[PDB]
Structures are given as structure tokens and as C-alpha cells.
Write a protein that binds this DNA or RNA. Sequence first.
RNA 1: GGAGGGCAAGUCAUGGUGCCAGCAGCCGCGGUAAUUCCAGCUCCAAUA
RNA 2: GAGGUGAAAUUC
RNA 3: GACGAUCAGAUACCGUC
RNA 4: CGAGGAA
RNA 5: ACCA
RNA 6: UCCCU
RNA 7: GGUGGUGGUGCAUGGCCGUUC
RNA 8: GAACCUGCGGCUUAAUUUGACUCAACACGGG
RNA 9: GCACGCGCGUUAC
RNA 10: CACCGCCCGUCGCUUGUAGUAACGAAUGGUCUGGUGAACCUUCUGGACUGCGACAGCAAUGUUGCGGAAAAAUAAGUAAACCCUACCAUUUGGAACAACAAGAAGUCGUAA
RNA 11: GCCCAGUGCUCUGAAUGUCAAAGUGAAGAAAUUCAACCAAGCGCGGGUAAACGGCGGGAGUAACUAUGACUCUCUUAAGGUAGCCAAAUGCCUCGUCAUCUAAUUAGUGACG
RNA 12: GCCAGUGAAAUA
RNA 13: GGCUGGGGCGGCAC
RNA 14: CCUAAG
RNA 15: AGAACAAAAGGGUAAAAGC
RNA 16: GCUUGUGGCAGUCAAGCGUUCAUAGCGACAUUGCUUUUUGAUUCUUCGAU
RNA 17: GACCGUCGUGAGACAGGUUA
RNA 18: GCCCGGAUAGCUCAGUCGGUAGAGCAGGGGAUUGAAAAUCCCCGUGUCCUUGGUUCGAUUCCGAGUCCGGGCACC
RNA 19: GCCCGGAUAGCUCAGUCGGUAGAGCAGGGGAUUGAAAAUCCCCGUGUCCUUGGUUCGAUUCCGAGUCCGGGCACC
RNA 20: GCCCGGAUAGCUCAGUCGGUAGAGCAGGGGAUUGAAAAUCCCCGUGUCCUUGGUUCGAUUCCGAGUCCGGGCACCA
Lengths: 125, 192, 95, 141, 213, 68, 140
Amino acid sequence: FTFRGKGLEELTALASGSNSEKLISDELAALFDAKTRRRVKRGISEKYAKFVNKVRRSKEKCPAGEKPVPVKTHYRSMIVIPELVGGIVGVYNGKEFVNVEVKFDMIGKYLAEFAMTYKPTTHGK
Amino acid sequence: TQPKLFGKWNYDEVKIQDPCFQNYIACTTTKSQVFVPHTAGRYQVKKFRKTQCPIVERLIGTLMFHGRNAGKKALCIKVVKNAFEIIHLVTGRNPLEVFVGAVQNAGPREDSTRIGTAGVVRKQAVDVAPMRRVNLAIYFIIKGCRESAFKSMRSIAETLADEIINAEKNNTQSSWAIRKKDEIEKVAKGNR
Amino acid sequence: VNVPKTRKTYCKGKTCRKHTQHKVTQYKAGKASLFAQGKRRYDRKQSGFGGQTKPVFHKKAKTTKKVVLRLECVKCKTRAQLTLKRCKHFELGGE
Amino acid sequence: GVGKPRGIRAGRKLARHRKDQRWADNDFNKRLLGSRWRNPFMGASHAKGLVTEKIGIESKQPNSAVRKCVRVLLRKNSKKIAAFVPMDGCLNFLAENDEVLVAGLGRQGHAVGDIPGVRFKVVCVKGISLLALFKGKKEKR
Amino acid sequence: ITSSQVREHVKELLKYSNETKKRNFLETVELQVGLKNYDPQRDKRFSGSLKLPNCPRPNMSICIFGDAFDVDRAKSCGVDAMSVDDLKKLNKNKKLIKKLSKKYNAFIASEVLIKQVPRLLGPQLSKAGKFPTPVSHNDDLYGKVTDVRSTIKFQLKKVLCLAVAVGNVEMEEDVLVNQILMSVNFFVSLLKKNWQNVGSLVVKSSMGPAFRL
Amino acid sequence: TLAKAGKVRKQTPKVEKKDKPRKTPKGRSYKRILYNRRYAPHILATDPKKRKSPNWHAGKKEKMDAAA
Amino acid sequence: EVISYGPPNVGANENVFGVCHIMATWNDTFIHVTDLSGRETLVRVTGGMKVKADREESSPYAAMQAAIDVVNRCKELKINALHIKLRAKGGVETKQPGPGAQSALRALARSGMKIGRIEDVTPIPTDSTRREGGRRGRRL
RNA sequence: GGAGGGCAAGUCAUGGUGCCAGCAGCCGCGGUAAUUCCAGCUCCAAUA
RNA sequence: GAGGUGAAAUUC
RNA sequence: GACGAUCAGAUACCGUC
RNA sequence: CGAGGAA
RNA sequence: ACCA
RNA sequence: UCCCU
RNA sequence: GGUGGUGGUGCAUGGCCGUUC
RNA sequence: GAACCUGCGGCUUAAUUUGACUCAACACGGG
RNA sequence: GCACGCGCGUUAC
RNA sequence: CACCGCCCGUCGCUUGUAGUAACGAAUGGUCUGGUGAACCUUCUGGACUGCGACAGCAAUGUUGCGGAAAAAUAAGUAAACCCUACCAUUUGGAACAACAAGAAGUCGUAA
RNA sequence: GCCCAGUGCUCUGAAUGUCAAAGUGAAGAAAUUCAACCAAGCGCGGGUAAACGGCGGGAGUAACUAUGACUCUCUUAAGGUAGCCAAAUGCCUCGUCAUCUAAUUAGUGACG
RNA sequence: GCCAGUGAAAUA
RNA sequence: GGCUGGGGCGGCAC
RNA sequence: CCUAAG
RNA sequence: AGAACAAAAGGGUAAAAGC
RNA sequence: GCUUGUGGCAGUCAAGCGUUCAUAGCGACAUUGCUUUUUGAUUCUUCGAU
RNA sequence: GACCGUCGUGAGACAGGUUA
RNA sequence: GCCCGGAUAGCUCAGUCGGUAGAGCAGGGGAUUGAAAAUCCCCGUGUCCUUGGUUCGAUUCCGAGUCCGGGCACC
RNA sequence: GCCCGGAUAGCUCAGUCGGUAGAGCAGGGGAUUGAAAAUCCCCGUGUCCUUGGUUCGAUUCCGAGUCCGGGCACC
RNA sequence: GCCCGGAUAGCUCAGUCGGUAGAGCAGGGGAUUGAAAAUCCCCGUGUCCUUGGUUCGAUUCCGAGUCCGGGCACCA
């Protein structure tokens, strides 16, 4: 018997609301931390929008055979958007692309926070 | 008219009976009779200026000596004033005529010079000078105050007060100061 | 092996009979020298040379003497009565 | 006067003295004691021999190198000889058991500063001067 | 000094006087000693007369008390008081335990103390002159006060004290000094070793001294 | 070693010799030429302390022409 | 009062004489006092009786104490003047007085004592006998 | 038969080799820029 | 207490 | 040679015989 | 962490 | 540099 | 001040 | 066959700087 | 000695640029 | 980059 | 390349070397005691043969004389061989051992 | 050569502990039974082996390799010294290498 | 003296 | 002393 | 071996 | 009934023979 | 003197060797035996002669 | 009978070595 | 001739109550030096001697042969 | 084959009475040195051989065994 | 089997003719120190083996007990 943060649906209506213009409607704004709000309210890029749609096609076209088409990106600076949940995006770190299944919890958080950029240390001598 | 110390302590209330300390102390001079122990003087310049320092200025100096906590005479002049009030409220004597005695007593008259030859640590009999004697006396007195004064609600103006008193008495059980004063001579009387 | 000093071991004497707490020590030894008939005659050799007597004495012991329990009432007024516990080594009341 | 005696009648003395004090010379003491005849060549200038095997020897002190050498068996003498094969490829011509002609290196005694216990040079293979085998246009078998 | 001179304290000392002939009225002699000088507690006495034979000579108020019932244990006679509300404040110490146990004779009371007698009541009084002795304390302090009043014998307890007697005026010698000894028993000797345990003493009658040792 | 025999020579690139342009006179002639190239009066003429090395002409085409 | 033993003769103008022998080694020091015939010993104090450490069995200090210790004992013998015979294991040893030498005398003079004649009796030999060590002696 | 010195003659910015191959009468050359190795060139010496 | 050492130690 | 000591080691430089 | 060892 |  | 460096 | 090179030799070197001071 | 800071070594790492090593390396290459 | 080993320091009992 | 300099020995290791004395053998030479070919000489010996006289004129025959081969003989020169001693010149020999040289082997530190 | 602890021997020695007979004291009414002191001896101290006799054992421990003058050790007086051998002492042993033989469980020369 | 008595324990 | 695959040395089922 | 391991 | 009943081993013993 | 473990000696079965083949020549395992110059048990005969 | 080693205080004792 | 024993890389050498194969030196690639020794990381290289058995598998646990390697051999 | 003796930290060896376990050496980290030694401070270490049994508790006390050692086997 | 001595701090041991428990060393804390010693101050713990009686009390005095140490004498 488990639920999710603020209602995965309220947000799909919150984000794609009457004015589903800028990827992050001023609605989602009220939800994010100052740092994130800063960025969006400041100057977010458009590329971040065509990447958006790339996940879109991956989420539907794929049959319920739960086999999503990994979307590849270097946009580690992207802050997961509500509609970005469910898809598996391959994020570059330094060597290759990392495939991560987007859960409801990783929203408002930087897409980079999952693409481990370095292998911490094991030891011996 | 006569400028009393801290406004309430006649200087002429004391005299140096022993000839030793007569020139190695300050109570005696006209210039020494100060209201405040702060002179920002220029002692420590020639090689004996220290003498002309109003005995208590010296006490205050030797008193603000622990690192971080110290380096600010402003306050120290206080810790010494309160301590004088407190010494008075107990023996009601001219607290200079107390501190003074203490200075004369707490100064070791004998020390041992470490003279080692090829590993062996030998010592000899040495008679301690006057200037050195006073210096040691004060250094010692104060040295102790901090000893107890640490994690204690007892205050320096109190610790110090309680010290200057017994230091005058020669009370070998109540003066970290005179303890060494005796031991240094004793051990020294052994090495001699 | 833990005996208990005095314990009502019925007994008698008599001029008493019934029970009676008895302070019970174990038995000791006793010198003889120059009284014993054993001596009165066993003083010999016969006599410009000697030896001893057929039983004297190197045999082979047992490594376990015996408790000479010596129970003795005080009301019965008499008489220090001996008993015989056999098993060594051991000692009086512990316990 | 000095040690030597200056008498016209004492010639004999001086004479015997010189004949005596003269043994102190090695060059003298050397040839005088038929020493030359006892060496491996028996006085000789050169000696023929059969290659017992090509061995290599290490240079001494400040030098480090593999010297080419052949162990030879002298004919009438019949001794084991240590013989240094000269120039570059030289040892590549000396086949084991061939006939070789050997001579000494600078006064019979100390070997060239570099070599260790070698006292001889190899000049002929199957009776063919080495130099000849060393220069193409000359000879080879 | 347990020597021939005993009859010099007795025979030769039995008509000394200090005037003329020898008077015309009755006599009064004895033989001085003690009780045991122990400490009036642990061990110093038991039972058995000499005699001896006497009683008071002057007063007899001794010691007997404990509870509200110990007063009547000193009413039809005369003794000292231990009090009730004092054994928890002041019924013993020095001049206190004394009071009740410090008279002349000794003590003839009963017992009742508990955890208090190693330095107070029962304690501080022993060699002083009392510390719980044998006075058949069960029916009272009168019948056994035959060992605390008259007859006697010579109950010798507390601090020294005892008695003696044999004849009247003049008719004793070897049995005069040997009457003084006879005037001594469980006070001159007793059980395991007791033929002597002192240093000296005194004696006479009324004349003058006895043994000049 | 052993098989390491003549490692050097085997490794050396055989360069050829400049096929004599003309000839080298052998006889009083050679000794003559030498006499001329060095002890001829024009060289004993200039200082005997400042005359060149009989081989400074190490075969240097650049200094070869500068002299002649 | 006191029962002195010096002969029955006083007089603040009558000198008493005691011959004080003093041997000063580089290890130990001795101080002796005796009749002017030296056949009856009176006072005998050595540095050893004066300190704990075997190295100090010489010392200037040990000489003071052993010295002053004798003077006290001497006023009781009723003797005030002392003849000094100073030595130092002459034999075949450093014929030089030790250290506790000038120290001992000094102490006797200070603590009162009158000083008679003074001799040096370190036994110098005519010949000698193979000394301490040999050939090369104490090395290091 | 040589061209560092002794011992007459290269100050070639030559190619190969890299303490290896080898030189060297004795000093000493050689361990990646060798004046002594291998070889080219040019030189020197005695010259049938 | 000697003796002995820088100190001591077996030694007396 | 026997011993003390000194040394990381001392049958050595000191010391007792 | 309660004033800090050899340095 | 050590001495204080 | 020349011990230590 | 050049440009350019935070690529290699500080023991190939200038220049500069540290140390002996 | 303590916790942080910063440099050097080490060990990791795709990679952890490299110089420097007794004062005459290590908050020094203005790092 | 961290099991750790060094060296300036910052803050403090 | 300058005391973090030089440097010594034990043992070990690496690369090597066969000396002096003795003995063995080879060649040559000498001594000792014997065996002794051959030949000069010697005393023999006398086939064969020359002469003279006698048996016949002759072949032949007897004897006297002379030369004379083989054989045999003694003393001698003395080859070779053997034995007994000694000299000279060469050459030989081994595991372990030994010697030689070298080093930032190993342990210490002598100088 | 080194061992005096062991067993023996042997010296004035040890400030002290045993140690018999007579002799002494104490106690009983004595018989008798308790006492204290008490020669030697003992035990304590020293010397003593051309006196009896003795004379160890395991760990580590580089400059292929095995190796011990090295040190570590636990240890009883001392821990086999010169010298000397398969020897008339050596177990395995017919020891291993030579040497003498056609051939050697013999000889001899070596080596520990 | 003792009924008073303290102290480490009272005597003529 | 004894018991003992005969006695013995050994072991104790003395 | 058990004063209780009677 | 695998525990416990001093102690060897076996018997025995459960409202007990154990606690 | 028994007995024969242990010794020695033969024997059956045939998996194996024997390069191709079990037996020419040998044979693991397993199993039946003979032997009384080993040795071991045993104590019968003989210390009141071997 | 007599050496030695080795065990034993001794007497002797060695399936040790040596000789008549 | 019977009684134990080792067989393992280029040569000398260890293995839970099997299941995996190792240092050392040779050795080539480095780090290091001025270059080199020394030293420190790395490479590599094999039925762990041939047979038969035991097991899921044996280099190892078994059984025999095998080579070289210490202890036993008229009277 | 019989009778003995051990085993404890990485090594050489102490200790216990049934409760605890140690030392020296090694070693790890700093300090002195220009750098190594030496030396100076700091530090960590134990199935007390495996094994069942007793006991409330075993390195320790019994019973069995493995290993490494030494000692007998005579007539 | 008798006859002497002891039992004390962790160690080795003093110790009223009944009133206190003390050395020396170890151990520890500190100054000093190239290293280690030696130095130099300051501490740490006690049924005084156990059980009773003498005494106001007792390490002490006496009896008894256990233990260890000494000694001396026999042993069929």
C-alpha cells in the first residue's frame, strides 16, 4: 500500500496545463527548490525541449512489453520533469552512457545525480 | 598631595627594609607613585630599564601571559585591582605592603646550573641575583594562579589575591609559588 | 569429610542414657618411653650386640590411616566414647 | 771512494761482481735460464694447432665485452692454448677442428690490456691467412 | 608479704593500742584484701564462702535498675536508678553509668540492652564498679541480695571490697593470721591457678597497722 | 654469446667507392704533387704560423671552392 | 656536668697537641687524630662515613663534614692544637695530594682549631716497582 | 699500413653500431649527437 | 667502612 | 686463564684477582 | 577536543 | 645557534 | 657565551 | 616541403631565479 | 595530539596533467 | 577520486 | 667525485692457475758384478800343393823337406745384453685440497 | 685444555642450629619425668681434579646453490681444548675417494 | 583520698 | 619372590 | 570421594 | 524419560528413589 | 617334533601388457595349493651329559 | 689368561673391538 | 633381492579430511640511474613421471611397474 | 613394536591454581640522518595441537589421536 | 620421630618488653636526557598466616592449628 509524492497525474495536468508552453510551467515552479526555480526562471535551453519529446516517443510506441527505447543524452544538467518519469534515459558520465529508469522520486533533482561520474575506491596494497 | 594607588592605597605606607631589593623595586620613587599601573612605558630597552617599572605594572604584565586568552593589559589591570581590594578585605593592610613582601619572599636565593660533560648531567651551587630574584618571584606567583584558576569558578583576582597573601606568609602549603621557592633551593642545596 | 562438631548421637554412658549433644574431637597419640612393659622387657639386645625383634618393621603401608572419632557428651557426664570412620584423607566440619 | 774498488790489481774482483750483480736483470735472468724454451711454443715464433673449441672471454676493468677466442691444441708441443681471434667477424671462419697458426701479442707475457689470460693470436684457418678471409675479394672456403 | 610476719600483723599486732592497759569494752578486728581487681565483668568471682563473715559496716545502697519494674526492685530496700528515657540520651557515659552502677558494693539488677553496650551503658562502668554480675536477677534483688546486704560470707565485686573475721579481743595467733587467710577464699584463690594476684594491702583491727612490709 | 659474432659488420650498409674520376699518379709524380700542394713557395710564402692543415679540406665542398 | 678525659690540665694559655694524619686519595679521604706518639687512636673520620654515593667518598663536602665532625669530638678530648701529617698514597701512586686535602685542613682551621707544624709525609720511594697498569697504562 | 695522444696526418657537424661488435703497442676508445669500432670520403707515412 | 670507576660492579 | 662492568656485539681499550 | 608522547 |  | 647546531 | 605544438631532452642552451650568503 | 583546510606520497581510476624532494619539494610553479 | 603515510595552516578544549 | 672519504681480514662467490720438493716414466750418460759375438796376435793343425831320392819309360806309389786352407787354442781389443748403484735432460699426475685475481658478496671495523 | 655443583678428600675457618653418657635445675613421696646448658660429629664456610670422575643440547642467519667464523636463544660445574680415526673404540658399514688386483666384506692413504 | 576523675592506665 | 609358548632380559592378565 | 552426595 | 540421584559400572527410581 | 603365518615354489579366471592380437612370451585383480635348507610360533623328547 | 673402549659405586656386564 | 622415499615450468623445490597449481632463478617489458648494479611490480612457460582402479571429476586418495635416492646380504 | 617429552603471538621459548596468558626478536607508524644502520618515542598479536568428556566455567583435569623429539629391545 | 626460626606492602624483610606498621626494591607520576644508566623529588597496598584467652585496648603476650624454613637422630 504505497503512494507517490504529489500525485503523478495532477502534475501531468499541472505541467501540460492550459498553457503547456515552456517545459516547466510556472506551476511546477512552485514545487522546485530555489536553485532549480532559479534556472528555469532565468534561462533554460530549447535543446532540453527536443530531448523531452525524444523520451515521449519512447514511452508510447513501446508495447506494454516494458521495453523502453533508451534515449541518449549529455544534458546531465537537466532537472527531471514530471512527464520524464517512466522512461529509461542513457546519460553520459565520462566513459559511456548510463541507462537509468526514471522513478517518480527523482524529479526536481538533476538528471546528472544518477550517472555516476567516477568509480569510488576499493583498496589493498 | 600624595597620589594613592587605584585611588586608595598610600605608597609611602611601605618601605624596603632589606637593602638587596632597594633599587630592584618601584614603591620607593616619586615617579613610581602612580594612580594607574598603565604607563606604556619604554622599559625593556636599555639592559636594566626593567628596574624603573612600578612593581605592579610588572605584575600586570607577567599576568596577561597565556597565549590566546591574553595579550590585553586593559583587562589585566582589573584582575589586579580587584585582587588588591580582596587582599585588603582580609588583612586590611596596604595590599602593596603585602604584594611587596610576597615579592621579597617568593624569590629563590639559590639555583643549580646545569653543566653536563659527555652525557652526565652535573650541577653546581649558584647564588641567585636580585633582579633575577624578583623576576622569578612574580613569574612564580602568577604562574600558580592559573594553576587552580583553570576550570574553577575561583577567579584570577581571587586566586591571585589568595596567593599574594600566603606568598608573604611563607606558608609552604598554600603557595605554588613558595613551593618551588623552597624546592629549587633544596634540590639546589643538594646539587651544590 | 565434613563431620559436624557436636551432634545428638543418642548414646548413653550410662547414668544418663537417651540422647545428648557430644563435643566430638578425633583421637591423638600418646608417649610411652620408660613405662611400657613393652619397654620393661624390650630393653635388651642381650646385649654386647643386638638387632631388634622379628617385627621391626619395614613392610608396606596403605596410605590411609583412620579417623579416631571421639564423640563425648557433657550431660551424660561421661564418657568420651570412641567411634570409627575409615576413609582418608579428610577433615572436620566444613561444609 | 764509492763501493766499487779502484785497483789495477783488482780486475778479477770487479769482473766477478758484474757477472753476479747482473742476475738482477730479468731480461738477462730470462734468456739465461732457458725460459724461452719452456713456453708453449718452445721458443718458436709460431705454432700450428687444431681448434679444440671456440670459447668467449669477458673483458676486464673499465671494459665489458665478449672476446672471441679459440682453445687450440699445438702439434708437437701438445698443450692447451688460449687464442684470441682478431678482427670483427673473424670467429665466423674458424670451424672446430680446423688447422690454425698462432703467434703472440706484444712481447710474450702480458696479454693486451683488455684480455684476461690469453697470450695468443690466430692468423690462419685451414692454412688461409685470416686477413684474407676478412676481405671479400681475397679468399674463402 | 606471705611470710612468717603474718602473725606479726596478727599475733604481735593485736594489742598495740595507744595508751594504758587495754580498755574494758568489746573488740573489732578483720583482714583487708579485695575482690579480684579484674574489671567487675569478664571474670573475677563465682561462688563459695571462706569465711570471713560480715556484711555492711556502713551503708549498702548499691545498684539495681532497668525498667519501670526495677524501681520496686529497689523500693522495700534502697538502690540506684537506671532510668527509662535515659539509655537513649544520658544513662551512661562517665559520671552517668557511674551514678546507677557506681555506689560501693557492686550491682544486683537484671539485663536488657540490645545493640548498645560496647561503649556506653553496659560498657562504661565495668572496672568503675559494675558490669552485670551474678545476683540471681530473676525473682528480684533481695534473696540474692543475701549476696548484697547481709550474710555474707563476703561478696567481693565492683571496686575491690570484701570482709574478714575470726575472734574477739585476744585468743588467736597462727590461726589469727591463718584466720585472716581463712577470711579469704574465692578472693585469695580459686580454680586454675590463683594462689596470688596482687602486690600488697592492709589490715589491723583498730590498733595500729599490721604487716610492716 | 657466440651467435652475436660480427653483429656490427653484418648490420653495416655497404656504401660504394667513388669510381676514380681520372687517376692517381703513382711515382715521382705523387711526391711531386704533394710538394706542390704544400711545400711549394706560395705556401711557405704566407706565414709558417698561419698556413692550413693538410686535411682541413676534409672533403668539404663548401670550403673546397672557397680556397680554390 | 661533663666528664672530659683530656689530661687534668686546663689553661687558656696552655696548648694541647694532637697529631692529625690526613691521607687524600682520588677515591677516599681520611682524617685521623692521635697522640704525638701516634700509637693510640682517638678520632677517625673518613668521607665514606659522610656520604652515600661511592663516587663522593672523596668530595670537598665529605671533607668538611668529616673535618668539622672531628673538631667537635676534639674540644671534648680537651685538645685545641693539631699537628698535621699530610700524605697521599705515595707508594708507587700519584704522589699528589687528593682533592679532599686542602678541604679538610681548611675545615679544621675555620671550625676553630689551632694548627701546629705541618708536614708532608707522602712516602716517596728510592727505587720503584711496576706501577698501575703496565707498559701503556690506563688507556681511554 | 694509419689519421684522439705518444706517432706525421680529418674542426668532416657523413652513414651504420649503442660498453654490444669490435679497436687498442701503452694511455684509453665504445653505454643514441663515438675525433680509436664498421664504412664512405679526404688526408698522412714508407713506397715495389 | 675500605678499595675501585665516568658511574658501579665482583672484591676486603 | 677466572671474574666483574661497557657495549647491538667485547673472551677489547677501565676495574678485581 | 578536557591543553596533547619521541620530537 | 644555545643560554633566559 | 661557545657547551649544542 | 612548411606552419603550429603546455610534446621530449635544464645534463644541448639562452634569459631569469633559488643556494652557498 | 583534535576536527576541518590546503599541498606531497600511496592506492584507485576510463583519467585522476605534470614539475619540484635535506635545508636549496609539499598553500611553491602567483596552482 | 580513498585503507592509509607526510608538510604548511584554520578553529578549539 | 674530497668521512655519507679511504680501507682490512675471515668465510663465501665469480673467473681462473699448475709452481717449489718428492715420486713415475722417457731419452742419454756413468758405476758395480757377470754372460760375451767378432777380430789382431799366439801355440797348435796340416786337407791341398811345390821340390828331391827311391818303386815304373809313364798315370800312380813310399818317404825326406817346404809353402799352406778348415779346425782348434791362450792371453788381448771389446760389440751387444743383464744385474747393482748414480747423474743429466725432458715430460706426467687426480677428487678434496691449494694458489691467483676481482667485487656496493657476508661479519665486523684494524689502519 | 675447561670444569670443585655432584662423591670423596682436606683448613685456623661459621656472629648463630642439632648433638650421648656422666654433671646441673625444676616437680612429686619416689620411682620416676620435664628442663637447660653439652666433646666430637653433623649441617654452614674455604681449598682440592698427575683425586673419582665429568666435557650440552635448537633456531633464525644469500648475494645459482648448499652453506657458518654470525647473532638469537633455553639451558647444568664446565659444554671436548690441543691433538686423532671407519683405528683394537664408528652404530648404520661391506662408511665415501683414491690406491694395490683381471676381481678386494682384506690391506694402506685420505675425508669428520 | 574517696562518692566527682580524665586519660592508652589513678595512689596514702 | 613369583606368573613365563621352555630358562632369561622384559611386561604384570600377582 | 559425600554433613549430605545420610 | 534423552536428566538427576557423592562418588566406578551396572541395576534400579517420574505425583518418585529426582527438586 | 608338529603348524606354515612368514620365505620359497608352482595354479586356476582373463582385465591387461605385448604397437595389429588376451595365453607366442608374459599376466592386475580375486582365488586353489605344494613346499620344510628361512623365519615364527609351540615346549613333546633330552641339564638324574647332548 | 690379557687389552680397550662403553654401563656399573662393587662384584662384574656387553651378540662391541682385540690377542693366546 | 625385499623396507621407506622424490618424480610438479627453463634448473633447484610445496599442496582444505581431492575440486585451485606456486614462489625462487633463468627471463623479456618497465619503475629506477647520469648509465649500471641492487631493488619493486608486471609476462610467460605444464595431464604436478606411465598404467590400471575410487568419484561427478584425481596432479592429489588408492594398487603395481618405473628412474634416481638413505637403512638389511655362507659358515 | 614397548616406556617417556613436548606443542602457547610471525619466530625462540616463559606461565596458570580451572577464571587471567606472556616476554625477547620480528613487524607497522612517526623521530633523528643528506640517506641508510644504530638509537629514540608510539603501537597490534593469540581455537594455548585436533579431539570427545567432566565442570557453572578447560590453554590448564581425564580419555583417544596426529606431529616433532629423545630412551629401552637383555639370557 | 624430636629440637630451634619464621608467617608483615606485589618482592625481600624491619618491628613498643601492650598504645604508630616501617624500611630497601619493584611498580607508577614528574624534572633531566643524543642513547641508556645513574641521579633528583612525589606516591602506591597491609584481618601483620588462623582460632580463642590476658588487657581498657594487643603487630607484640600465652595456648592451640595449618604451612614453610632450619637443623639433629634413627630406620626391622
